[PDB]
Amino acid sequence: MREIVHIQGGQCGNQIGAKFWEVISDEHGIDPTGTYHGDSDLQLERINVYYNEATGGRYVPRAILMDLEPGTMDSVRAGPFGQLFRPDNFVFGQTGAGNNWAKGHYTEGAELIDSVLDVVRKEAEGCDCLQGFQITHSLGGGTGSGMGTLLISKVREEYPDRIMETFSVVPSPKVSDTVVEPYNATLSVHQLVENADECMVIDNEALYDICFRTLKLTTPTYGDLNHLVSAAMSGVTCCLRFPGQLNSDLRKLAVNLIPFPRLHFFMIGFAPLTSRGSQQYRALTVPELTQQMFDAKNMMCAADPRHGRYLTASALFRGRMSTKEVDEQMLNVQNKNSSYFVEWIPNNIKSSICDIPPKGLKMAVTFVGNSTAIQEMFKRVAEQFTAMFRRKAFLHWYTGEGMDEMEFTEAESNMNDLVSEYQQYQDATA
Amino acid sequence: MREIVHIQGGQCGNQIGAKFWEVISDEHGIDPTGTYHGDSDLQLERINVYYNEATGGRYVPRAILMDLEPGTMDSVRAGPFGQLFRPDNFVFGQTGAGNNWAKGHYTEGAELIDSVLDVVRKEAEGCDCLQGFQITHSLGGGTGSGMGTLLISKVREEYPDRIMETFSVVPSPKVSDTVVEPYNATLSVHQLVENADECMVIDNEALYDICFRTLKLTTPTYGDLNHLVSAAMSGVTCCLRFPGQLNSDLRKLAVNLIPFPRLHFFMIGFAPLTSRGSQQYRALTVPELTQQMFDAKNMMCAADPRHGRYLTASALFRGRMSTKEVDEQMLNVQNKNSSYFVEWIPNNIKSSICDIPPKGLKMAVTFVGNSTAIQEMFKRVAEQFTAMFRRKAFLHWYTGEGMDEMEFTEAESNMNDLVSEYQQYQDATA
Amino acid sequence: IEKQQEEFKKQKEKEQQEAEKQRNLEEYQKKLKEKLHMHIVKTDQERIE
Amino acid sequence: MREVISIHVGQGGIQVGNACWELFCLEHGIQPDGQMPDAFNTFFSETGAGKHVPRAVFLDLEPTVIDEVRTGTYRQLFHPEQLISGKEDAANNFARGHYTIGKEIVDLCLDRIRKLADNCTGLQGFLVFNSVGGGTGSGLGSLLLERLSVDYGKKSKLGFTIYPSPQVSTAVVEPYNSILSTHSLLEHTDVAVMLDNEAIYDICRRNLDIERPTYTNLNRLIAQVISSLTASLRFDGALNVDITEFQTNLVPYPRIHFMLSSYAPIISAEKAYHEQLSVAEITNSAFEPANMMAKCDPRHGKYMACSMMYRGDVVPKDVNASIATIKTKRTIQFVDWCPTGFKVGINYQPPTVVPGGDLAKVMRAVCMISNSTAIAEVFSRLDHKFDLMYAKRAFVHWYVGEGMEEGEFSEAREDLAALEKDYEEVGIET
Amino acid sequence: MREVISIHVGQGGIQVGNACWELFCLEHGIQPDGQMPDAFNTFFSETGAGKHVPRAVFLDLEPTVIDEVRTGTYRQLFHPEQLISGKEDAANNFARGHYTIGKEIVDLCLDRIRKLADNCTGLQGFLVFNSVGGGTGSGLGSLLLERLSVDYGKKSKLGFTIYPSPQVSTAVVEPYNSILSTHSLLEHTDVAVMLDNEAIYDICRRNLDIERPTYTNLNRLIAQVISSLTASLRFDGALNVDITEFQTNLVPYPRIHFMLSSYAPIISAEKAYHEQLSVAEITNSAFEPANMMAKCDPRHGKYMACSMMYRGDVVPKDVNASIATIKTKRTIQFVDWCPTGFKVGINYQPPTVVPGGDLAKVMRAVCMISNSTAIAEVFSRLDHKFDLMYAKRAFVHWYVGEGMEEGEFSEAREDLAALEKDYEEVGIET
Ligand SMILES: Nc1nc2c(ncn2[C@@H]2O[C@H](COP(=O)(O)OP(=O)(O)OP(=O)(O)O)[C@@H](O)[C@H]2O)c(=O)[nH]1
Ligand SMILES: Nc1nc2c(ncn2[C@@H]2O[C@H](COP(=O)(O)OP(=O)(O)OP(=O)(O)O)[C@@H](O)[C@H]2O)c(=O)[nH]1
Ligand SMILES: Nc1nc2c(ncn2[C@@H]2O[C@H](COP(=O)(O)OP(=O)(O)O)[C@@H](O)[C@H]2O)c(=O)[nH]1
Ligand SMILES: Nc1nc2c(ncn2[C@@H]2O[C@H](COP(=O)(O)OP(=O)(O)O)[C@@H](O)[C@H]2O)c(=O)[nH]1
Ligand SMILES: [Mg+2]
Ligand SMILES: [Mg+2]
């Protein structure tokens, strides 16, 4: 019951999913052949959340994979746990977008999306009670940031009451791999605010910083960043698949973390994270988890959370632990940092406890906090956008496929209005 | 409860700690792998004073090691009992100070100290009831005498009510290994008087004299001086870790040995000390301990204690012995030497008894006396400082990093004022 | 001896001033909060109307 | 021929219902399978041959807790189709569980209530349990109370609500639905008992000496209080009290029926038997402000009426001799228009112990239900918390979009203001 | 139906309380576990079945001694939660234990005192033990006495304080807090008994022939004196004396209640039986100046009143025949306005012997409590010691910085001057 379907688009989203599904399968004891080989009874009670049942007793994820080029899905199939995905759900084009948002949203993405919407509708109509959808995509690419966001609007138009999740990677100015990143980032943020019920920003720069400083491993690769993102993704829905002292589905988090409908851009972090050589030194206790949870360097975004004030915060503890300690520590982390918490909403931290810890760990915490410090990312994105747009650089590529500069002006104005009205509440006082 | 954390800086402080922690571990029966293998029940009751607990049952010291160069900590790790130290507590720079006080206190030491202060704050906030801090460093080096003393002020600013210990090695003019010793000694003494609650001076010359005359061993090395300093260090806090007839924590000594807040520079000594060939001749009795305890050559400083009068004295007896004998001997050592005790404060000797002797010894004594004879060390240090400063020798190295001669003049004036007002009470009469 | 009396006289004067300052600040804050609440009530009436 | 029906709604309600239903089964000798290997009739019903069926119904929209109940050791006890479960959770939204999804479930619950009531012949009244700071709990409790008040009329209903702590909180939006639910049950429930978690945490910490409590320890104490309240209906006693004999003794006026409870003694077996546990000392401990089961100070207000139950071998003369002592004390003062304010009940059955629990076995116990003027502080602080966020209309869109009108928030505020004015008007002397 | 409560505060107080509580348990036949294998009621209370609980409470801020008590053979005797312990020691600072850390502990002690007093029905009075020359002892004793004097009023309190020796001292700052505590208990305690260590050391050396005594030997003699004083309340005697029958016989004026004690015989089993130990010789030995329990010379002053207790097979006529002989002697002279000054008590129970102790078993013993004019010498010498350091304001900063005012030292000096003038005014003949 109350299950969700997985939809991913683009190369970055496909690579994120290729590790997210591996993590989920390892958590539920599903072999790469789709056969259950788990140890505990609880591993099968709520498997309908992510997995479907077919004849022969094997399980198949309800994931939908889409891209405008076939290479990435032809590569993910040969990887581990690549056989679980149903071949029918693979939809792709023969041309690609070339990191051009217009091509992936107006000319090419519009004709292809009917086929993927057909299978999306097939998956949603069938399921017992829908909880919602979760979306993984990147804002630094053309086909992803175009087709995914248009699909968001199409899904929202047909299921207005369901919940919608988006895990979005925004292009940081530090590690830049594409010159046309500001254009399709700014165009995508315009559409994303209007339809997504929840959005979670993730930055490659913050992932590299975490890998270099906390884990202290010499050579980070995309596999480590994907693993961290996958652990963070799994931590959110853990209590929906396992029993606990205070169950809290996604809708309950939506109620408690979004004060106003347009303020739904969160930054997350996962604890504990320790190096291989120091994993024996540390002792896992609730104070040790909560001190690392609110650490500024532990956030999955380069945004500095002590440059603003938290509107609200959430924590999803895992493992068996006493609730009194959790509540007193949450109170203590809020009394010692009163300057960084907005004062006109008292008791702005939500807590939840799940009795099933991750495989290999005795305690774990997932942190989701809505803070005013996120304005800095939109500020720098808009700064680069307005630095590049004033000369109409690279504009002809977009304008040759039916798009105009008016949609750029409206997007810039709406993004600046969002930036302004997000900080409006930072200076608000009672 | 009432535990303390260990912080050491510089090469000399690191070498002192490398033997202090070995002595403590041998006293508590902790193997170099962190596993308890002791014999007595009392060995574990108060182990929380110096050691933390981690998963797997092993113990880890709450020590913080800092230096401006990585060599010394990369060397102490390979020594015996080097694995106990948590790798996370090691903080170091890549440049070093080059025995220049300005570099280790203004330019390089200021930027690095944030990281070490982070772990210091982590250690202190967590512990059950803080008693205080103890600091080991040398006044003859640049990075040590700069960063340690600035850290003293930073710690004092945040914990004004806790107690602070400093074991400071001052450069003697007899055995000189650095030409710029007077400058960073005089600069450090200026800051040390303002913030340290207790200070204990130790001289290499006195250690060599003791090793050559009392122990009569042919070839002294730094390991023997470190062992003597470590035994003296352990003797002070013994009754805080073991039961006894009259327990006396560090704060009780602070109350009883410091008459005025600026007179907190003590010189110490340890008894008994006997040669290998004469360890069978001697019989350990309270008179034998007390006659060696007040012996002038037994002091850990070259200062001659019969060149002045004791303001107060303290003794920390170890082992099981009768209190009546201790009190009568303390009275006798004060009646036969009335000329060397100040007359306007009667009964100026404090005694304490701890029932647990050192491993291998049946009785031991640690002596801490506040005497007016310490003026001679500051006199000679200031004499060398003013002999070198009048020509502005080596001054450009310090003045090229933002420091000026005014801070030298103020330091000299304050040090001379301390020298004068310390002897002011020597001639005072009732 | 002169220095001893003078030193205690200068220190004694310090401490008293600090205690008094803290008390004044606290009282002021409480009165201001009450006034703000009444002003808020009148504003509430206008929005309701 | 005397019966009572208990209603459990929400996660907290179900988790305290489990706690009370181990205790009742243990106290009446019924095995977890429901089989005995004439006092049971108050809570149970005979099936003709063999097992007993509880007169209880479990409600929740979120299926996890009910599924946990239906697989534990008590799977055979409860009737399979009185554990009504939904599919979609209200997610802390009050408007959801009162207007959207609770309406489609409430009919089945009312049908079950009718089917249980037609079996009883001497129905004393209803009991209901619900944690107030949640969507489904507060909303469904309000709707059920409103339906029952018109279906049955004058039958008595008792509510054991758990209000949020003064500063400790798990959600961020619980003041809104707490205020709305207080509005709903103010004019619909005959008795409401205060049960916030912080006071019980302090009780456990101080008396039970548990430093890491969980929810089960709290629920066991609540279950013991319920058993003490309802013991008089199913055991012989020298001075009996019925449920219907409350509004004539504790409720001076129809609006004022919120009171706070206390229990004594609370002590562990490790140090219980060293002291005699006389009736005087337990009745003194019960009146201690620190032993209130709700975090309110009785020293800040007058008492209106005290109803307090004993059980064990207590003799009435010893009870009178202790009521006199309490009337003597100057720190406890009653209201002017109430000369006598004590209602005393005495029962013979000593409290039963649950194996593996915290409380030890004792021969005397006291449970007090006291109505006092000091309860207005919790209303004032909840009102202050509500006003802060309602000034800016925060989180209101999550409620307006679930069918609730804009003006519904204001009238709850007006009713709380009326209640606070009424509490002030009653407490003034004539 | 007669009871007394003993209060033990500080290290010396707890160490003498242990000494008296072996003796009482041995004298009433109670095993160390508290189980007997109607006279016990004075010191103990019956729990209904089995063990007995002492009417004593142990106080200390420094946890070592209490932890030693809670692990010895007497762990099962004392109630677990009447051994109140702190975390931080006062460290010989009087201002600490009266203004800073003692205030937060005193409330628990007063609650325990109330809980013990409500059990007693015929409470005779309180006993208190505290070594005066310490921070926590003197400060907490002063605060407890000040609270009790107003909570209970006219109930009698007896203080067995241990003043410092004339020349032998363990601390260096004990005159300050000794004078302050004398100030505090001058107007707050009904009886104060002198107990300095030097006199008892001389007694042990001369009579017991022990050349290396420890604190236990001193505490056993003090325990024997306490037992002799309180024997008359729990054993049948030809001439009984109650505690309340003291201020009418030994205290001529409300200010004068400091008196010094003596005991006889004190002799070892190796030479005890060679002599007959007649009543005349023991009552002569008790009046010998060298057998005073405080180092004061009675030949330097007049006597005011002598209260002296016998126990064993003594006959009153032999007592009278010995009082006459003492009145005859020319070296002992009484004050002019007191014709008869002796109060005599006779008890039948001989003193009990502790196994492994120093004293032997005898059939006759005498304990005298004598009030004499010569006690002013200890006040004069303590005053002289105080003035020497207070002239230069030494060690005052350790007290001013703990909340105490500057002028508080002067008024204690004025009260001592008043007491010394009063003692001179009383001793002059009319
Ligand atoms: N005393 C006690 N309180 C609980 C317990 N579980 C939850 N609560 C309280 O209940 C409040 C939230 O309501 P819940 O009962 O957890 O959830 P709910 O009532 O089912 O409402 P939903 O969130 O819509 O499911 C929290 O603030 C907790 O303080 C419990 O086991 N014991
Ligand atoms: N007769 C006797 N005197 C003692 C004993 N122990 C300590 N004293 C005296 O107590 C004085 C100091 O006070 P302590 O009792 O030791 O310490 P305290 O009262 O707990 O005060 P703190 O130092 O703050 O802990 C010393 O001068 C001793 O003479 C003892 O066992 N027997
Ligand atoms: N975490 C992660 N990020 C990736 C990976 N591959 C690419 N990216 C990010 O995705 C961005 C490029 O997106 P792109 O591949 O053009 O998306 P597309 O246009 O939808 O195919 C780069 O800035 C990378 O930082 C990966 O394997 N893991
Ligand atoms: N006791 C002892 N003293 C040492 C040792 N090594 C160096 N010293 C002393 O430290 C002084 C030099 O200090 P330095 O190493 O420059 O301190 P740094 O600048 O902080 O690294 C010399 O005068 C030595 O006497 C050692 O192993 N033991
Ligand atoms: Mg729920
Ligand atoms: Mg002590």
Q: Which residues pair with A353 in a beta bridge?
A: A317
- Name the structure determination technique: cryo-EM
Residue whose C-alpha is closest to residue A245's, from A181, A325, A185, A305: A325
Count of all residues that appear for chain A in the document: 430
Residue whose C-alpha is closest to residue E381's, from E180, E137, E164: E164
Q: Which residues pair with B92 in a beta bridge?
A: B67
In the residue annotation, E429 being an active-site residue is answered as no
Q: Provide the 8-state DSSP code for B84.
A: S
First and final C-alpha spacing in chain D: 45
Query: Separation of A350 CA from ligand 1 center, angstroms?
Result: 12
Q: What is the DSSP string of A335-380?
A: HTTGGGB-SSS-S-EEEEEES-PPTT-S-EEEEEEEEGGGHHHHHH
Give per-residue burial for B250-266: e unless 16+ CB within 10 Å, then b: bbbbbbbbbbbeebbbb
- Please enumerate, as own/partner, the contacts of E101-108 that have beta carbons within 8 Å and a separation of 24 or more: E101/E61, E102/E61, E102/E136, E102/E139, E102/E140, E102/E143, E103/E143, E105/E59, E105/E61, E105/E140, E106/E140, E106/E143, E106/E144, E106/E147, E108/E84
Interatomic CA distance for residues E92 and E174, integer angstroms: 8
**Are A87 and A41 contacting, i.e. CB atoms less than 8 angstroms apart?**
no
Interatomic CA distance for residues E223 and E17, integer angstroms: 8
**Are E249 and E342 contacting, i.e. CB atoms less than 8 angstroms apart?**
no
Residues 6+ apart with CB under 8 A from A323: A245, A246, A353, D213, D214, D215
Cα E387 to the center of its chain, rounded Å = 27
**Ligand 2 atom closest to Cα of E174?**
27
Residues 6+ apart with CB under 8 A from B259: B311, B312, B345, B370, E394, E395
Residues 6+ apart with CB under 8 A from C24: none
Contact: E171, B256; criterion CB under 8 Å: yes
Interatomic CA distance for residues D50 and D38, integer angstroms: 14
Q: Provide the 8-state DSSP code for A294.
A: T
**Are D96 and D102 contacting, i.e. CB atoms less than 8 angstroms apart?**
yes
Interatomic CA distance for residues B87 and B76, integer angstroms: 12
Q: Compute, in degrees rounded to 10, the torsion defined by CA atoms B387, B389, B394, B398.
A: 150
Count of all residues that appear for chain C in the document: 49
On whether the E3-258 domain is CATH 3.30.70.141, my answer is no
Residue among E51, E80, E118 whose CB faces D281 most closely: E118
For strands A63-67 and A90-92, give the pairing: parallel
Interatomic CA distance for residues E318 and B334, integer angstroms: 49
- The angle that helices E135-151 and E103-117 make with each other, rounded to 10 degrees, is 50
The verdict on the CB of residue D6 being under 6 Å from ligand 1 is no
Interatomic CA distance for residues D426 and D340, integer angstroms: 17
User: Could you tell me the two tokens for B7?
Assistant: 């912080």
Interatomic CA distance for residues B7 and E62, integer angstroms: 25
Q: Tokens 């420094």 label which residue? A: E62
In a 10 Å sphere around its CB, with 0-12 CB exposed, 13-18 middle and 19+ buried, how is residue D83 labelled? buried
User: Could you tell me the two tokens for A353?
Assistant: 């406890």
For residue D62, give the amino acid letter. Answer: E
For strands B364-371 and B310-318, give the pairing: antiparallel
**Are A180 and A268 contacting, i.e. CB atoms less than 8 angstroms apart?**
no
For residue A385, give the amino acid letter. Answer: F
For strands B51-53 and E44-46, give the pairing: unpaired
**Ligand 4 atom closest to Cα of B225?**
1
**Are E38 and E88 contacting, i.e. CB atoms less than 8 angstroms apart?**
no
Interatomic CA distance for residues B362 and B319, integer angstroms: 6
Interatomic CA distance for residues E59 and E10, integer angstroms: 6
Using only C-alpha atoms, chain D has a radius of gyration, in whole angstroms, of 21
Other CB atoms within 10 A of residue D374 CB? 19
| Domains of chain B, start order | 3-256 (3.40.50.1440), 265-374 (3.30.1330.20)
For residue B153, give the amino acid letter. Answer: S
Interatomic CA distance for residues D88 and D97, integer angstroms: 10
Kindly state the helix (H) or strand (E) to which residue E341 belongs, with its residue range. Answer: none
Interatomic CA distance for residues B117 and B100, integer angstroms: 22
Q: Tokens 């007191």 label which residue? A: E338
The residue annotated as part of the active site, out of D245, D281, D377, D408, is: D245
Residue whose C-alpha is closest to residue A184's, from A7, A376, A403: A403
Cα E333 to the center of its chain, rounded Å = 26
Cα E324 to the center of its chain, rounded Å = 29
Other CB atoms within 10 A of residue A387 CB? 11
Residue whose C-alpha is closest to residue A237's, from A12, A34, A83, A47: A47
**Are B255 and B198 contacting, i.e. CB atoms less than 8 angstroms apart?**
no
Q: What is the DSSP string of chain C?
A: -HHHHHHHHHHHHHHHHHHHHHHHHHHHHHHHHHHHHHHHHHHHHHHH-
Residues 6+ apart with CB under 8 A from D376: D301, D419, D420, D423, D424
Q: Which value in Å is the resolution of this experimental model?
A: 3.7
Beta strands in E10-155 (DSSP E): 44-46, 52-54, 56-60, 83-85, 123-131
- Nearest ligand to residue E63 Cα: 6
For strands E3-9 and D303-312, give the pairing: unpaired
Indicate where chain D has its CATH 3.30.1330.20 domain(s): 259-377
Please state, in angstroms and as integers, the Cα–Cα distance from residue D182 to each residue in A81, B231, D142, E190, following that order: 53, 68, 9, 59
Beta strands in D200-349 (DSSP E): 258-264, 303-312, 342-347
**Are A159 and A130 contacting, i.e. CB atoms less than 8 angstroms apart?**
yes
Interatomic CA distance for residues A78 and A72, integer angstroms: 10
By alpha-carbon position, which residue is closest to atom 5 of ligand 1?
Answer: D12
In a 10 Å sphere around its CB, with 0-12 CB exposed, 13-18 middle and 19+ buried, how is residue E354 labelled? middle
Which of left, alpha, beta for B29 (phi over 0: left; psi -120 to 50: alpha)? Answer: left
Other CB atoms within 10 A of residue B222 CB? 13
Query: Separation of A234 CA from ligand 3 center, angstroms?
Result: 20
Interatomic CA distance for residues E401 and B260, integer angstroms: 12
On whether the E259-377 domain is CATH 3.30.1330.60, my answer is no
Interatomic CA distance for residues D402 and E419, integer angstroms: 83
Question: Which chains neighbour B (Cβ–Cβ under 8 Å, 3 or more pairs)?
Answer: A, E
Q: Which residues of E are annotated as a binding site?
A: 11, 62, 131, 135-136, 170, 197, 219
3-state secondary structure of A96: coil
Interatomic CA distance for residues B36 and B352, integer angstroms: 29
User: Could you tell me the two tokens for D92?
Assistant: 């802390």
Give per-residue burial for B31-68: e unless 16+ CB within 10 Å, then b: eeebeeeeeeeebeebbbbbbbebeeebbbbbbbbbbb
The residue annotated as part of the active site, out of E146, E198, E245, E377, is: E245
Please state, in angstroms and as integers, the Cα–Cα distance from residue B242 to each residue in E68, E92, E359, E421, following that order: 10, 19, 31, 47
Residue whose C-alpha is closest to residue E127's, from E246, E253, E248: E246
Query: E410 and chain C: CB distance < 8 Å anywhere?
Result: no
Query: E121 and chain D: CB distance < 8 Å anywhere?
Result: no
The verdict on the CB of residue D135 being under 6 Å from ligand 1 is yes
The C-alpha of E97 sits at a distance from chain C's nearest C-alpha, in angstroms, of: 21
Residues 6+ apart with CB under 8 A from E22: E223, E354
Interatomic CA distance for residues A237 and C4, integer angstroms: 71
Kindly state the helix (H) or strand (E) to which residue E118 belongs, with its residue range. Answer: none
Other CB atoms within 10 A of residue A376 CB? 16
Interatomic CA distance for residues B242 and D342, integer angstroms: 55
Cα A344 to the center of its chain, rounded Å = 29
Pocket of ligand 2, beta carbon within 6 A: B 246, 252; E 10-12, 15, 62, 89-92, 131, 133-137, 162, 164, 170-171, 174, 197, 215, 218-219
Cα B228 to the center of its chain, rounded Å = 11
3-state secondary structure of A75: helix
Indicate where chain D has its CATH 3.40.50.1440 domain(s): 3-258
Q: Provide the 8-state DSSP code for E3.
A: E
Q: What is the DSSP string of E161-206?
A: EEPPPSS--S-SSHHHHHHHHHHHHHTT-SEEEE--HHHHHHHIII
Count of all residues that appear for chain E in the document: 430
Please state, in angstroms and as integers, the Cα–Cα distance from residue B336 to each residue in B331, D57, E301, following that order: 9, 91, 32
**Are A293 and A367 contacting, i.e. CB atoms less than 8 angstroms apart?**
yes
